[PDB]
Amino acid sequence: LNSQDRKDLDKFIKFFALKTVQVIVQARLGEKICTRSSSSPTGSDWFNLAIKDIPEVTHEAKKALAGQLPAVGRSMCVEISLKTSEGDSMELEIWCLEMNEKCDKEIKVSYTVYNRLSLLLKSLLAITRVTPAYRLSRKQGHEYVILYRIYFGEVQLSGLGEGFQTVRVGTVGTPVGTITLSCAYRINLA
Amino acid sequence: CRSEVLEVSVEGRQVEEAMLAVLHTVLLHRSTGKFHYKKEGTYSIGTVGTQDVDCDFIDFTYVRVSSEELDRALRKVVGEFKDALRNSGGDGLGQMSLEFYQKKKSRWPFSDECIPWEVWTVKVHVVERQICREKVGEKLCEKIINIVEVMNRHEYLPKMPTQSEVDNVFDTGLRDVQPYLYKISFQITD
Amino acid sequence: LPPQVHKV
């Protein structure tokens, strides 16, 4: 429960949440994402991953968080929806970044929490390409588009249809709680 | 040393793309930025970029690290796998395996000991073509989800090395990405 | 800004 470890864990978590939004939204824009690797330490690439930030998304993500971090009862959710040219909307995905009360006492925030979050981000990248909404998002732009919303609070799972699936992207244990990242997605594309 | 087994049934034209999807997803998790050491136990990390890859023979996209050197290498062994399959002329039974290992340094005249800590094994059954393009894509979606779930079980990772140990943990020969030491081989069981 | 260096 050390102080310098607390300020660093909060910064790690905050930036992990911000990058989680960016990864999810960029996976639903309709374009392939191809970023560059560099041997040289850029000094500003969070979790050592080449994630170019979209400013609008960063602003929208900060407004939902409002200077707060995930905690028990306060989860960050990215909602992904389909909107037709005629105005119909169908919910596709709910990504939830949660933190629970379960603590990991012997875990080093200095680099072990950092590197596990970096791994979780990488799992997020892979998973966003293989859920049913990815193909829909790549084909978007004419009869429909893909919209997104960022809630911060209680997780509500309505709107995905009976029989929706949930995939756990992964978990990171920390001295103040365990981060869990998952996706609940609709399979009845009606 | 933990071992993970994947099985997949594909058409002959789909063998190469299905193996790269799996190997690249695994390696996406099992690599980091290139280390640049300042002191013995002090270093900084480069940045990993990623690429989306649409398959030509499977209706499927996967994320890979953006490194032509690493992609060319995986293509080489997978192509030999396919040559052995096409030359086998059996029922279409074969497998590739990817093993991550550390090195213990040895004294003259012996070679360093290679201690594997993770092996991934992918079994293939080669087996109208229209419905297969989608069924294999859905199956591949399962494998990547499966791979991610194994990843975050957090079974064991090598201790992060000092400058003197860095070549017993990581493959530092690539220009832009730094994978854990690994070996790929294959077998034909037709 | 992220951690600039990692100590082992």
Residue numbers in the entry:
A (entry chain D): 5 to 194
B (entry chain C): 3 to 129, 136 to 198
C (entry chain F): 832 to 839
From the paper:
ATG9A is the only known ubiquitously expressed transmembrane protein of the autophagy initiation cascade in mammals. The TMD of ATG9A forms an interlocked trimer and functions as a lipid scramblase. The ATG13 and ATG101 subunits of the ULK1 complex form a heteromeric dimer through homologous Hop1/Rev7/Mad2 (HORMA) domains. ATG9A, ATG13, and ATG101 form a multifunctional hub at an early stage of starvation-induced autophagy and mitophagy initiation.
We designed a fusion construct between the HDIR and ATG101, using a flexible linker of five residues (GSDEA) to increase the affinity of the ternary complex for crystallization. We determined the crystal structure of the ATG9A HDIR-ATG101 fusion construct bound to ATG13HORMA to 2.4-Å resolution. We term the interacting portion of the extreme carboxyl-terminal part of the ATG9A tail the “HORMA dimer–interacting region” (HDIR). This structure shows that the HDIR binds to the HORMA domain of ATG101 by β sheet complementation such that the ATG9A tail resides in a deep cleft at the ATG13:ATG101 interface. The HDIR peptide binds across both HORMA domains within a long hydrophobic groove. The loop between β2′ and αB in ATG13HORMA (T46-W50) is positioned to support the binding of the HDIR. This rearrangement supports a hydrogen bonding interaction between ATG9A L832 and Q835 and ATG13 K15 and G47. The loop region of G43-Y45 in ATG101 joins a β sheet network between β2 and HDIR residues H837-V839. The interaction between the ATG9A HDIR and ATG13:ATG101 is distal to and thus apparently independent of the safety belt region.
